[PDB]
Amino acid sequence: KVFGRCELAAAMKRHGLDNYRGYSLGNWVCAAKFESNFNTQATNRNTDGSTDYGILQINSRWWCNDGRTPGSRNLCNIPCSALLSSDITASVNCAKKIVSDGNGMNAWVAWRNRCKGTDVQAWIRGCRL
Ligand code: NA
Hints:
Monomer. This protein is about 30% helix and about 5% strand. The chain has four helices and three strands; from the N terminus they run ααβββαα. It starts with a helix and ends in a 15-residue tail after the last helix.
């Protein structure tokens, strides 16, 4: 599923991401935009053989099992394919574990390079939330 901007903001809000660990909703929508272009089916392979999955591009080296990333951990205890669902619940629950990991949202390279220090509130402007 490809989300609309406000549609995603609302879904994320409903799932408790708004100000989760101090990150306003705009941060999460911005990260999703540049990670996946709001497409839950986004996948991308990394040079190390791991793969990023879903709307927040969660990586198979640490967070999910895709059966083809040798010596990886499955810290969110889920098949990576569950991250590609139109229901973002698994992605959001796993993201909460990631953002709690010590580095905050810096774990998402696109957030660090493209959202961090920008006016992120613009990503939820105009939305009925
Ligand atoms: Na893994």
